[PDB]
Amino acid sequence: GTFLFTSESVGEGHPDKICDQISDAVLDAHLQQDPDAKVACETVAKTGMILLAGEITSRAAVDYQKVVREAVKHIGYDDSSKGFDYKTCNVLVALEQQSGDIAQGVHLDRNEEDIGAGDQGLMFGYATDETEECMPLTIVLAHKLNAKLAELRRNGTLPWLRPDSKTQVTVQYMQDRGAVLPIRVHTIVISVQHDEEVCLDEMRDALKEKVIKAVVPAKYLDEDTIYHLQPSGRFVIGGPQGDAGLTGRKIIVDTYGGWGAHGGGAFSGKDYTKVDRSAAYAARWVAKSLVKGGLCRRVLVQVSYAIGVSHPLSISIFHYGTSQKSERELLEIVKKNFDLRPGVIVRDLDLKKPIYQRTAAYGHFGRDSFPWEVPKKLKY
Amino acid sequence: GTFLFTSESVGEGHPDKICDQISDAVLDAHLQQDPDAKVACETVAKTGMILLAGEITSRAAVDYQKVVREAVKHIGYDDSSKGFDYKTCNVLVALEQQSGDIAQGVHLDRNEEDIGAGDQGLMFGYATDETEECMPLTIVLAHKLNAKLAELRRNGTLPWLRPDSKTQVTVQYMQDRGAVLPIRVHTIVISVQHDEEVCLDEMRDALKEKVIKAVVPAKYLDEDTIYHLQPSGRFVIGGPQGDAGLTGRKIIVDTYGGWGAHGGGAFSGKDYTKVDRSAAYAARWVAKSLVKGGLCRRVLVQVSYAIGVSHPLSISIFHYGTSQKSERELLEIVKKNFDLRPGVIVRDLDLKKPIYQRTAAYGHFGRDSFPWEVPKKLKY
Amino acid sequence: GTFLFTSESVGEGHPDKICDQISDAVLDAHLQQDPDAKVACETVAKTGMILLAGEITSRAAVDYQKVVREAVKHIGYDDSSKGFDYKTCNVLVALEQQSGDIAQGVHLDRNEEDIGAGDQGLMFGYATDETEECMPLTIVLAHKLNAKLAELRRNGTLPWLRPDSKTQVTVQYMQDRGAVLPIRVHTIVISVQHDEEVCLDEMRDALKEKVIKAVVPAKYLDEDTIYHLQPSGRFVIGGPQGDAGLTGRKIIVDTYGGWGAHGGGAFSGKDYTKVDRSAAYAARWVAKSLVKGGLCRRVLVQVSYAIGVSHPLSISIFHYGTSQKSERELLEIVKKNFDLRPGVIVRDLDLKKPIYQRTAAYGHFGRDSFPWEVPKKLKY
Amino acid sequence: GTFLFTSESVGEGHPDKICDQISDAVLDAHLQQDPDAKVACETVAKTGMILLAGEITSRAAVDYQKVVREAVKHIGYDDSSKGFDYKTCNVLVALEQQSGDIAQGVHLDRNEEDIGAGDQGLMFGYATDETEECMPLTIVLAHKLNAKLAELRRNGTLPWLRPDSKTQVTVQYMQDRGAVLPIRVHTIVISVQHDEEVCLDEMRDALKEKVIKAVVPAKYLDEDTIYHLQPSGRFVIGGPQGDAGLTGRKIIVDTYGGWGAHGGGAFSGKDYTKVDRSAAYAARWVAKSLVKGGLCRRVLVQVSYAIGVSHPLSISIFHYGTSQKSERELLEIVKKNFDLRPGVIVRDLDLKKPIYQRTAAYGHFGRDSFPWEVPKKLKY
Ligand SMILES: C[S@@+](CC[C@H](N)C(=O)[O-])C[C@H]1O[C@@H](n2cnc3c(N)ncnc32)[C@H](O)[C@@H]1O
Ligand SMILES: C[S@@+](CC[C@H](N)C(=O)[O-])C[C@H]1O[C@@H](n2cnc3c(N)ncnc32)[C@H](O)[C@@H]1O
Ligand SMILES: C[S@@+](CC[C@H](N)C(=O)[O-])C[C@H]1O[C@@H](n2cnc3c(N)ncnc32)[C@H](O)[C@@H]1O
Ligand SMILES: C[S@@+](CC[C@H](N)C(=O)[O-])C[C@H]1O[C@@H](n2cnc3c(N)ncnc32)[C@H](O)[C@@H]1O
Ligand SMILES: [K+]
Ligand SMILES: [K+]
Ligand SMILES: [K+]
Ligand SMILES: [K+]
Ligand SMILES: [Mg+2]
Ligand SMILES: [Mg+2]
Ligand SMILES: [Mg+2]
Ligand SMILES: [Mg+2]
Ligand SMILES: [Mg+2]
Ligand SMILES: [Mg+2]
Ligand SMILES: [Mg+2]
Ligand SMILES: [Mg+2]
Structure with a gap:
């Protein structure tokens, strides 16, 4: 009668997600001055580096340097000891106009309708x-778990939590006449960047107690539920410095976590005509x-x-x-x-x-x- | 009884696909000298630029400059008038070791089994x-159509075809007891980069005749089949110069074209432990x-x-x-x-x-x- | 009574000189819209890459992409077979505001006088x-010799000449009461980038005859004058692809060719307050x-x-x-x-x-x- | 009988000087494994960014990432609050082989003599x-003054001193039969990066007392000697983040401070054949x-x-x-x-x-x- 199904999410400081957030910072910033902007901005994150590659045709004047750095400020990456800092990192801007070949095919000379x-x-x-x-549920809970981490990080409750994280949730379902009914949480995974100075035990306790028990309805938890909390052991090196980050590389996290289907297309960095x-x-x-x-x-x-x-x-x-x-x-x-x-x-x-x-x-x-x-x- | 279903593919010169191909050039190149290499290489393509971002721990000595440029040579991008050239482009290498934090969690001290x-x-x-x-079928034919283009480009038959392309195929199916049966091709789309000097009519004819009719079984084609052949009109600006390219951004093209499901994960640039x-x-x-x-x-x-x-x-x-x-x-x-x-x-x-x-x-x-x-x- | 003295110059396509020219393209472009612009733009040239690093505080809106590419267009670097091309190269923009710390020290709150x-x-x-x-004279003639090359390249007379070049001139002087009198040209050197297809003999003849004899007064030339014309033999690989280029790295060429003295400071990329x-x-x-x-x-x-x-x-x-x-x-x-x-x-x-x-x-x-x-x- | 003469120097953390130091880190690193290496490495520094552009043909295996970061570690730039940090910055490597055209002209087939x-x-x-x-003397004292700063920074005595600095020294000379005799120091200038939290008065005192009086023989100082100590007022933003840095842009500091003459050529980044x-x-x-x-x-x-x-x-x-x-x-x-x-x-x-x-x-x-x-x- 039952089957398992897993879904993942990642935090605001996950290197891919940074790029996604930066590419939409850049998008919002144009749309703020030019509603009909044409924007295809890709961001790439790696140690000390944010890079913007793509095509933009707009009347807006935009300080990409400000736009990116504030985006990275809002994330929490604001000191060298966190492995990334908006103040002192490099921002490269490799941005051009939209291909005029594309321009004529898509949008020149026709009712906006x-x-x-x-x-x-x-x-x-x-x-x-x-x-x-x-x-x-698998994806909803994955998101909420990264959401709770962010809440606890920015409010002080766990000032050892850093921006980079990943959750993963597996739920035991049942088939009700083509529809699905969640029954229990089979396995939760959480791996979150931390300060050097906290021990593993302390984190795992805090994740079980402050994060999961806060986030998951206790009706979906029981004594058989597996937890994998900091499975690696150590995650002090995080964000761009751990792992290169690209825009559009969390597009299953962005949508339905393996459920339904996906067409291949990324969201961030793109105006409506995309x-x-x-x-x-x-x-x-x-x-x-x-x-x-x-x-x-x-x-x-x-x-x-x-x-x-x-x-x-x-x-x-x-x-x-x-x-x-x-x-x-x-x-x-x-x-x-x-x-x-x-x-x-x-x-x-x-x-x-x-x-x-x-x-x-x-x-x-x-x-x-x-x-x-x-x-x-x-x-x- | 019937439903439609669309899938896309893209050629070897599509800016994303370039990166995917470059990231696996870089992977093969290590594995050629160090079988147990740890590789997480992301490539980014834009006008004049290939950039490599990521993590590599290996005993291999690798000339990234050679590895990339040959990769771009094999693609066909080998002159400025094609909008990209392996000889004269920039290659940036922002490559580090694998995070030691990850190193200890995954692979230090345990039977390779x-x-x-x-x-x-x-x-x-x-x-x-x-x-x-x-x-x-939707995805199989999408691939074959880009495959035929490549054949015709490199053999001379259409020396106006350039490396960048995209196909898209829509098939009318029927539901046979949970399984699916392809019935007809409803819509084919092809958009392929070209030399300035050829006209549109000539291309569309050649695509209908030399590419589609060569590739699609005539049993799946009929008088109602829609064709959208160079729908934009003009596609002289192509590859990285048209559109920024990222590794892992054609991961639905890489797999099942919307059928089944996808987990979010990219393939290229990664050794087995990924x-x-x-x-x-x-x-x-x-x-x-x-x-x-x-x-x-x-x-x-x-x-x-x-x-x-x-x-x-x-x-x-x-x-x-x-x-x-x-x-x-x-x-x-x-x-x-x-x-x-x-x-x-x-x-x-x-x-x-x-x-x-x-x-x-x-x-x-x-x-x-x-x-x-x-x-x-x-x-x- | 006599001493020798050498001075060099380089052409418009010399990789350093490109940067110098690009950094002043960027300067002029601001001054065209904002007379009181504060500009410290450094350019770096290498294969496929122009990069702009520095500080700019200005009211001007500037398309760096256009500004650079036209600069590189005007130079002559406009095809892959020349080793560099404004159309398809990469332009990176790493440009920030002027340090506010500098801003307050130099120019906030005081009569422009x-x-x-x-x-x-x-x-x-x-x-x-x-x-x-x-x-x-040593430096004047060095410049004129690169000037003549440019004339002959852009007018057709030697359509094998490419943009990259270097001249060097040595003159035998005499000391007249603290002042100096040029007497003869002792050694001229010219090395200039060329198309694959011309032979060495043909170039050396053309340099002796069309360039030097056109440029140097025959009173300063004689049968003892040494010529070193394409001393390397082969110079098909030139510009940024041969040799990385930096702004401010031809500051002796920019001034007096070893005569007098230099303070260390570069010129290009800088507004008046520099x-x-x-x-x-x-x-x-x-x-x-x-x-x-x-x-x-x-x-x-x-x-x-x-x-x-x-x-x-x-x-x-x-x-x-x-x-x-x-x-x-x-x-x-x-x-x-x-x-x-x-x-x-x-x-x-x-x-x-x-x-x-x-x-x-x-x-x-x-x-x-x-x-x-x-x-x-x-x-x- | 007397004339004035000024010369400048800059510290180890001056953005140009960083590049010079990084380019020779990269040189030493090759020469350590391959004595006959051919090296033309240019470094560029800006906020969060070190970039290496140039030509290297060598048998050495070199971790540029390590080589650069240690170089930047040795300088003192090791925290975000100092405006630059070796741990978390970006390092770009745009390094190729030496032009084969140059290779044949200079060094293939001839006694090393x-x-x-x-x-x-x-x-x-x-x-x-x-x-x-x-x-x-002007240049000797300029150097010593930056030298003393470094001593005091790394030993603790002034732990507010940061790596970036510039000194400038002007000496009143006399002409003795073609030779020169230093007589008095007319003007000393010192501007050095500092922590936010120290006041101006405290710094100026410390520079007069701990640096200048330690470094300049008191025979060259008197009551007329002008001091310009932190002339700007504020210098918290320093190194690459203040000012873009290029290899070979302190070549008068590297040599004779305006005395004699200079040929135009930079030193750092280059093996002997340069x-x-x-x-x-x-x-x-x-x-x-x-x-x-x-x-x-x-x-x-x-x-x-x-x-x-x-x-x-x-x-x-x-x-x-x-x-x-x-x-x-x-x-x-x-x-x-x-x-x-x-x-x-x-x-x-x-x-x-x-x-x-x-x-x-x-x-x-x-x-x-x-x-x-x-x-x-x-x-x-
Ligand atoms: C249209 S682009 C992506 C849109 C882009 N971000 C922009 O600047 O609007 C997607 C792909 O379609 C192909 N393409 C590019 N230019 C095209 C054109 N003018 N007509 C048709 N297809 C094109 C290229 O392979 C390109 O990578
Ligand atoms: C493990 S990484 C990707 C693997 C990477 N390409 C590599 O160098 O092997 C994927 C994500 O997991 C998270 N992560 C990074 N380091 C980690 C660690 N030591 N333990 C657990 N998770 C980590 C980060 O958010 C990172 O972006
Ligand atoms: C003033 S900067 C060069 C000017 C710069 N191009 C600009 O943005 O205007 C030259 C050097 O002086 C030093 N410097 C930087 N900021 C300074 C400040 N606020 N006061 C004094 N010296 C400073 C740094 O070492 C810097 O590299
Ligand atoms: C020889 S290069 C500098 C050496 C370079 N750093 C290297 O890779 O060895 C200096 C300049 O000389 C010119 N040049 C380049 N290749 C040359 C060649 N094969 N023969 C003569 N001159 C050349 C170019 O203008 C170049 O910028
Ligand atoms: K990655
Ligand atoms: K794209
Ligand atoms: K150079
Ligand atoms: K500078
Ligand atoms: Mg990723
Ligand atoms: Mg798409
Ligand atoms: Mg893409
Ligand atoms: Mg993944
Ligand atoms: Mg140079
Ligand atoms: Mg200066
Ligand atoms: Mg400088
Ligand atoms: Mg030189």
Whole structure:
């Protein structure tokens, strides 16, 4: 009757996640001055180095040096003894205009409504009634565990916690008629960067007690639950200095933690015309609607695009057999109710607002507000 | 009865794929001198720039300058008028040792057999009987279409084709008792970098005729099949100069094109102890076996790991209802037949051999040899 | 009676000189929008790479990417087969604000007239009546020889000449009562980058005939004059790809070719408040005046500064015994006639005008216009 | 009767000087394993960044990461609150082989004795009997003042002193029959990086009392001597973070502080075949000999070279009228006694020994040992 399922998350100071956060700092910063900015900024993190590579065409004036350093300040990386510091690190800027070849194909000369896609791609959307957030529990708890760490780090409670971390959660489920029901937490993993001077025992206790027991409902915990708390033993070297960091390299953490499917596309660093972002948020929007709106417990939604073309080439809706209504019918309800041309998406989900930096840690989905988490009512 | 499903691939000269190929050039190059090398090399591509960021502990002496430039030579990027050239570009090397903190947690002091994982993570494996390769058709054809382009570029037939390209394939399927049957190709997309001097008409004809009709079985093509051939119109600016490139940013192209699931982990740049690679190939190995070995038409396999721990924390097998035998039974057959500790995987799949550069374009799966595509016989 | 004396120059495509030219491109570009810009931009050239490191506080908006690439376009480096190309190279921008610590010390809150120096330093000025330009012949001819190469390269006459070159000139002098008289050219050296396909003989002939005989008065040439024309034999690999390039590493080429003295300070990349530039041009201005104005045949002038202090700490005038009037008297004539506070210099020599890129090749002295080559009339 | 003359020096933590020191760290490191290494390594320093650009052909295996970081560790830059730290900064390595075009011209196929020059150039040598070191006092004292700072910083006495500093010394001389006699110190300048928490008054006192009075003979100080001690007021931001740093940009500090002449060539980063170094040390060697050996009080010596040619194209000896013997005669004594072909120089001055890092701060001349400071006895 039961199966296991694992998902991971990572903290704000994880080297990949830094880049993701920096690339959206850079995005917000343009959108703050030029709503119709075209942004494809990739960040790379390594010891002492933040580098920005990509394409930007904008009217905004932007101090990348300020934008990056504040981003790294907000993360907590603010002293050499933490293995990284916004004050004294290097920032390289290798940023150009958008390819004029791309410029003409995507966005020159057409109503903002009938804008062609920014690239080709495939994007997925998912939602499940296993949780309030309409997300898998495995990923929801993974995020919350890194969230709690951050809370405890910045409030003082564990001033030995450093910014870099990774959680991983495995849950024992059961199959209820195509839908899934979480039953117990089988294994939690936490590895978090720390100050030299604390011992291992002290950390593991604190993670079991202050983090996990605070975060996981005790109904999902029991005497058989395995804990792997600082499994390595030592994690004083962290962030960029431990491990090179790249934008778009935590795109399963950003979405559904192995559940449903992924199209390949990264989110951070990209304005609305990048359909890797706009369509992906739309597809979430749609899936969450279909569940909340009563048609299914669990749903998967594909879309695909061609560069230069506005409508999608394909739309697919898989409901796992959790729906009375057919597969051609949900397709028709989605079609009645959504306009998945990237230029109409942006109106509905307000995607010119510089709110992207909030998205670049703890998931782009299942989260407090954001426009795409707010389900539309369905007419059918 | 039918649903659509899209998948993309990209050529050898796609800026991401360059990095993936360069990161495995760097990996092979170490493994050629030091079989037990520890390698985490990330490449970044942008106009005139290749950069290497990461961690390497090895006894090998390596001329990164040679290793990269030959990699870029083999790709075809060998003149300024192509938008990139191995002779005259910049190569930056920001490479350090592996974190000693990681070193002690993973691999110091233990039989190579009982080596702990290199990191935490989740990894998926998939196989489907819809094709000979045991892969989805959508992704198989996407790869072949970029493959044909490369053939035609390097043999002279279309000496206007440049290295950068992207294909995308959408197939109309039908559900046969949990399994899937491809029926028709609904939409093909191809966008490929070209010389200034050729016109659009000439290219589109050549793609329809020389590439698609050569690659797609005519049984999957008809008068309703949509073609989007150079949808942008112009693609003279390509490779790194068009678009920044990062290692590990085509990890859905590298695997199953939206089918099954993905754990988040990138492949290129990593030796065997990186379970993002070793377990992922093992999970493919297992899924392909279960199908070829007669137990299922379509199967998905999760595994997860903890950094420092050798055994996996979880193993999951989903067969889509295409199997007579239960879900606890396939689990037991896999367990009887495989040892998913990363240090035993490496023996069975021969993963110290410097064959990784071959993997970094056209998929890591469904491909000619490679040890993980060769199914093990099952005892049960 | 006679002594030898050598001086070198280098072309517009010499890797150091590229940087010097790029750093003044960046300077002019600010001064074009913000006359009171504060600029300390260092450029570094190597294969495929231009990098900008330094400090800039300005109101100007500047596309460094455009500014650099055009600079490299104007040089001639515009194809991969020339070993460097403005289109496809990498440009890294590591540029910050000016240190606020420096900002307060130098320039916040004081009449632009009584501005303190930008740094400490020593600067020299020299002039000699051996030539019309009031410069040493050795250096004048070195420059002209690289100048002729450039003329012949850009007009077609020798389309095998590439941008990188170096000349070197040695002249046999005689001592006339403290002053110097050029007598013969003892040795000329020329090494210039070329296309693969031309032979050595052809080049050497062309250099002897088209360059040297065009440039050197035949009165200074004879049958004993040594020529070293492509002394290496082969110079196909040139510019940044041959040799790393740094701003401020041809500061003896920029000035007097070993004659007189140098204070250590580089010129390119710096606005007026950098006294390494402003005082050095002033000291030239003064020396040229004293000679043209009849008081000496040959003169050397030191000045020094303290960071934050406006007046100079010292002024020295050495006339080589070529002056009727004493050493305390020339000091007094200079003092009567010049105001060497950097903020008064800038008014007199018009040093906010974006004319600096013209200075960054072929010398900052002995040249057509520029304000500092135009001697002031002296009252005494 | 009297004239003023200024000279500057800078500390071990001055951003230029860092690069110079790093480039010789890299040189020594090769010479330690491969005596006949060919090295042209340029370093660039800026906030968080050390970059190495250049050409190296060697059999040595070198961990540039270790070599640089230790170099920066030895300097004192070892915490974020000092504005730079060897632990956490970025090190970029853009290092290639030597141009094969240069390789064939300079050093393939010829007795190590009759090796051609590594490049063209002009180099100067100087010596003066005004001091024991046979150097100008202005520069000797400038160096000692930065030397004392370093002593006091590393021993604890002023643990507020940071690595970055600059001194400047002006001395009132008199002309004794072509030679020079120091009379008084007219102006001393010191600006040194400090901790936030010390006040200005405290520093200025300490510099007057602990540094200057310790370093300058009281015979050269009096009540008229001007002091400019922290002239800016504030210097908390220092090293690379204050000011970009380049190798070879303190080449007047490295030599004679404005006295004599300079050929343009930098020293650090270069093995013996780079005549910018080998000939310059030889010319010092020669000048010091002529003075110590009794033929002159003050002497200047030019040499020049052609790339590929072993003998020098020119040799010049100016003795300022401080010698009984003529100008053609000293030429003949030098010629009798020295072999200025770069491959014979290296034997005599032992220039394959990895002692270069000691040279890269406080001057390459007037210093304790080094082979070129040890005068040869003259036969004449
Ligand atoms: C369109 S780009 C990514 C968008 C990019 N970030 C930008 O600047 O907007 C994605 C890939 O599509 C391909 N591509 C680039 N230029 C293209 C063009 N003009 N038309 C079609 N495809 C293009 C390249 O292979 C490129 O790496
Ligand atoms: C282990 S690293 C990736 C492996 C890396 N490429 C290497 O050098 O082997 C992945 C992430 O795990 C976390 N991590 C780093 N060091 C760790 C340690 N010593 N123990 C546990 N987790 C660590 C960091 O957040 C890091 O980004
Ligand atoms: C003043 S800086 C060069 C000017 C710089 N290019 C700028 O941004 O204006 C030259 C050197 O003086 C020293 N220096 C830096 N900041 C200083 C300050 N606030 N006061 C005095 N000296 C300083 C440092 O050693 C620095 O390398
Ligand atoms: C010889 S290089 C400097 C030596 C260099 N650091 C090395 O790798 O040995 C100095 C300059 O001479 C010129 N040059 C480069 N290659 C040359 C060659 N093969 N023959 C003559 N001159 C050359 C270039 O302009 C170059 O910038
Ligand atoms: K990584
Ligand atoms: K990209
Ligand atoms: K150089
Ligand atoms: K500087
Ligand atoms: Mg990563
Ligand atoms: Mg994409
Ligand atoms: Mg990419
Ligand atoms: Mg991973
Ligand atoms: Mg140079
Ligand atoms: Mg200076
Ligand atoms: Mg400098
Ligand atoms: Mg030189």
